[PDB]
């Protein structure tokens, strides 16, 4: 069962799409990023959830939400750059 | 031609095993079209080769009476949010 969101958690999330954003833009520390998704699990358990989250942000946007993720947590890198 | 070998981290095993469990639930009691195409699209993070994805879906099919090419297709195509195969 999902739990709905409060304020609070809106602006959590949008935060971690700018991080995303962020990533392609002039880079991000990785500590940042992973900040910022580490939240945005908190509040999006589900990987369901977070797969159609995914799609829906880059049917608008030229990136990729889980390979710049799975290059933050995998890599040692302090300053990432998609 | 080449013979494939498909090197993937844990979790995305189980991306792909939700995946074909995602296309028998569409045949089953039907799935939201969101969230078919929220799998595929994680399965196309891990498996961007065509042909790769060509052989997987005919590997499964073999031993499943599902059509990963015409659930997709459907759900891509039309824009009812219950997919029902
Ligand atoms: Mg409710």
Redesign the interface.
Known sequence: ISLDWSTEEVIDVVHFFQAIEQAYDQGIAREDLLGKYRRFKEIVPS??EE??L???Y?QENDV?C??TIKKAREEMEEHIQM
Do not use: G
């Open positions: 990987k369901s797969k159609q995914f799609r829906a880059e990729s889980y390979q």
